[PDB]
RNA sequence: CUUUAAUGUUUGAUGUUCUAACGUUGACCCGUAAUCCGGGUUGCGGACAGUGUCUGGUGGGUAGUUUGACUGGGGCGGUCUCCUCCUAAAGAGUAACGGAGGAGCACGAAGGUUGGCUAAUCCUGGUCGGACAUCAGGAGGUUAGUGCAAUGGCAUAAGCCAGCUUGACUGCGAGCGUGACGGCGCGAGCAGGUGCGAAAGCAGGUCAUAGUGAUCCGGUGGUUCUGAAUGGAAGGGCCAUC
RNA sequence: UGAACUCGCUGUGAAGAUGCAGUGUACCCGCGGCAAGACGGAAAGACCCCGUAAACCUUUACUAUAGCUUGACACUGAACA
RNA sequence: GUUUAUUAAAAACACAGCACUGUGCAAACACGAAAGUGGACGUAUACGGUGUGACGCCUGCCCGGUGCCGGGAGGUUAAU
RNA sequence: UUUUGUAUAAUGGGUCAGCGACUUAUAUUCUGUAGCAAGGUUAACCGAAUAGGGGAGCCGAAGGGAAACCGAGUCUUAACU
RNA sequence: CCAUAGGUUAAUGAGGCGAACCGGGGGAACUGAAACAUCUAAGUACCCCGAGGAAAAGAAAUCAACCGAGAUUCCCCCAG
């Protein structure tokens, strides 16, 4: 049997050109109007996962 | 949205359940060996209103709305329904 | 759709390029619908493009051989 | 054996800790735009070629080396940077 | 909990929005600010909305 | 709105009657030497009941499970997140059920900018007037004030008032600070577009640190970005946001 | 039933010693006795806590369900008010 | 009289009696996916359940809570 | 053996002999190594078959974007010093 | 009355057993989710019926893309 790649992790992270991942950034769902707008445009483009987490995104996907 | 458990609600404390809500007059608290707290909390009817008694223990908690009480002025008549008045922001009420 | 290279285009069949032809020459596959062609260098043999979709730098660069890019 | 009761405590909260103070000592050559000083009210002001944050944070606007200056009739602490 | 939030809905053309909050109950008209538009990049005066 | 009918009403609510469905654990006849069953007239019921599907109520009769953690044993009581100070040993960080307080906001002015101003509390004099209203003068020195606790801070004032206003604006942002990470925080300056000031300049919130929670799912508005043959739309995507 | 060529004492020590240190007494080996010790033998403590263990039992704990119960359709029709 | 055979024989349970309540018989109720049996080849002086426990003297007040029973007006309410 | 820590009076073993515990398949990843090298390799299957045919396919040489799209660039942006 | 239901006799056929394989009827829980109710486990275990040497499906009211492929089964892919 071959590994079966984890869903959840795959619709949020894609490979890029060198290995790395790239994810979305998570506080953009709700009361987002008591924030300043400094907060609302940094966390708006795309970011890399960092070393101390990139172990555990490389294990739940082999294929990807 | 508000949450008492029994080891909150003491005194005039507005709780609802079902409804129709409810008032605490007053309460003991037994916390006895060998088995879990509770309270003898003699609630008060708001709405008929006249009496009801339960014995809450521990758990659970109860929604606390709504609480409200303060002066009014009555000046109105009309068919069935009255009217009041505020002194503190002139708010009309039904 | 599938990306091509120019290293892999002096070998369809002849001069002319399609999506026929290509598919026989395993480089794209069988269920390709669009292709295009990609500045990745060396590019020899006067190669005749028909209905793909040359980018910028191949057409500069197919040109410079001596090809001609259609649509 | 006997076990008598116990009282409470009222206490035990406390904050996480900000990591306030002075990043870059003196004559310690930085980058545009470097943090110098993270404090709550001005301990140390802004001087020459040196802003301040809403957050009253000193920090550097130009190249050099981190200077501290005892200046004023107020004997206060300012924060110099000479250009290097 | 006092203090709800209310939406700024441009007068213009263009379906940008922006959202604050204001206490109804101690000034019930409406603001009428004057703010940027991102779209018609005009100065745009807003109206407030739900 | 209501009392009142004439009408095609939409049709329900029941109430008698009739028998041919159905019930018959009433008798009688036969299969049959058979209180099972089946057929036959007939008698009493009768479109009720009963059963099947859908559906609301009731339901420990029964079934599957949950019932938190730190803890100077478990329990009981108390705490769980965030902010200020001390413990914390002159960078930072640092525990305990160690000593103390606060927060789950407020504001379209209490924000931006320009101009102008400097208190607390005692003392003297003074209509009603007093320990304390307002006025006049001095001593005095920021012991005052800062929308709200606490430390730090501020006179160039961030303290107070007024004129004029919405920079509490969009796209970025070299850089570093702080975190295991998710994240948080500061940010010169560039581009577009305004505000105030004659002008230099300042403004992407409030003197600063508390006033807040990740995702999934779901709702509103916009944008052909995709749209299961094609042309559309539905549903997704992006962005604003609940 | 790890192996033993298996003393008393005070002290130390995983915190109550036949084995360690100091010192004292004691020829070697059985049988009959007595049970203070070998934290003796027998039961992976029954009590207490822990486990995101199980089991039954209880109830206005949660979601369900048998059974009971209401209505509509179906088997199910005909005359008049 | 009965009971924890294999540490508890009792103050436990049972008991005649008493009272509430259910049931008009194709009964209630129980067993059974159902037909069918028990109840009973009985039928309210009968049967099922519940509580108390011979007998003598007695069994007071409270309908708010909860359960049960009755009434249906008004309000809220499913499939359709 | 488990522990901050054991002669411990903490656990286990009367002794002997035999048996008794990090594996297997298929995927993926990294190092060492071998072959070929901008190319490498075949899977089932035909097969007088561990030979030879079989390029269906997989991976790499081009990435960026949510996507259409664009392409040694590209996205965000009305445009990016 | 006719006729049936029923009764007797004959003819041919079936009953039962079998190691697994296949079609249909019925159908769990432990476990995984670090608890658990949806889900997973799993249409697996097992119960029952029926057929064969294999069985089941099977000659398009099917895909496909606007060009074409022509029933079913099985294996490698596509593809975690």
Redesign the pocket.
Request: with cysteine.
């Given at each position: 049997?071959?590994?079966?790649?984890?869903?959840?992790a795959?619709k949020?992270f894609?490979?890029?050109?060198?290995?790395?991942f790239?994810?979305?950034?998570?506080?953009?769902?709700?009361?987002?109007?008591?924030?300043?707008?400094?907060?609302?445009?940094?966390?708006?483009?795309?970011?890399?996962?960092?070393?101390?987490?990139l172990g555990l995104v490389?294990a739940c996907?082999?294929?990807? | 949205m508000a949450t008492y458990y029994s080891?909150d609600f003491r005194a005039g404390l507005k709780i609802m359940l079902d409804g129709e809500p409810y008032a605490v007059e007053a309460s003991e608290?037994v916390?006895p060996?060998?088995?879990?707290?509770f309270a003898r909390v003699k609630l008060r009817?708001l709405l008929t209103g006249?009496?009801?008694?339960?014995?809450f223990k521990?758990?659970?908690s109860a929604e606390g709305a709504d609480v409200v009480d303060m002066n009014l002025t009555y000046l109105y008549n009309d068919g069935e329904f009255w009217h009041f008045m505020n002194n503190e922001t002139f708010e009309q009420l039904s | 759709?599938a990306?091509?290279?120019l290293?892999?285009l002096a070998k369809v069949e002849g001069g002319v390029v399609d999506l026929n032809t290509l598919?026989?020459?395993?480089?794209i596959?069988?269920?390709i619908?669009?292709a295009?062609?990609?500045?990745?260098?060396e590019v020899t043999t006067p190669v005749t493009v028909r209905g793909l979709?040359?980018?910028?730098?191949?057409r500069?660069?197919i040109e410079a051989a001596g090809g001609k890019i259609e649509e | 054996?006997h076990?008598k009761?116990?009282?409470?405590?009222?206490?035990?909260?406390?904050?996480?800790?900000?990591?306030?103070?002075?990043?870059?000592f003196g004559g310690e050559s930085?980058?545009?735009?470097?943090?110098i000083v993270?404090?709550?009210?001005?301990?140390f002001?802004a001087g020459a070629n040196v802003?301040?944050?809403?957050?009253?944070?000193?920090?550097?606007?130009?190249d050099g080396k981190v200077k501290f200056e005892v200046k004023?009739?107020?004997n206060?602490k300012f924060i110099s940077i000479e250009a290097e | 909990?006092?203090?709800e939030?209310?939406?700024?809905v441009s007068s213009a053309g263009?379906?940008?929005?922006?959202?604050?909050?204001?206490?109804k109950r101690?000034?019930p008209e409406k603001?009428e600010?004057?703010?940027?538009?991102?779209?018609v990049?005009?100065?745009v005066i807003y109206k407030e909305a739900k």
């Open positions: 049997p071959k590994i079966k790649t984890v869903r959840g795959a949020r894609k490979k890029t050109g060198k290995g790395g790239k994810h979305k950034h998570a506080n953009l769902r709700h009361i987002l109007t008591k924030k300043a707008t400094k907060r609302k445009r940094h966390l708006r483009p795309k970011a890399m996962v960092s070393k101390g987490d490389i996907l082999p294929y990807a | 080891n608290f916390k060996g060998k088995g879990q707290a009817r006249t009496r009801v008694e339960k014995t521990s758990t659970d | 759709t990306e091509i290279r290293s892999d598919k026989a020459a395993n480089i596959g069988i269920q619908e669009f295009k062609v990609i500045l990745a260098g979709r040359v980018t910028k730098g191949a500069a660069a | 054996a076990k009761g116990l009282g409470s405590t009222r206490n035990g909260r406390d904050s996480e800790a900000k990591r306030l103070g002075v990043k870059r930085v980058l545009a735009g470097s943090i993270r404090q709550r009210g001005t301990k002001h802003g301040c944050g809403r957050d009253h944070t000193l920090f550097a606007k130009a004023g009739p107020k206060r | 909990g006092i203090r939030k209310i939406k700024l263009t379906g940008h929005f922006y959202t604050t909050t204001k206490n101690t000034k603001l600010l004057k703010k940027f538009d991102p779209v990049r005009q100065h």
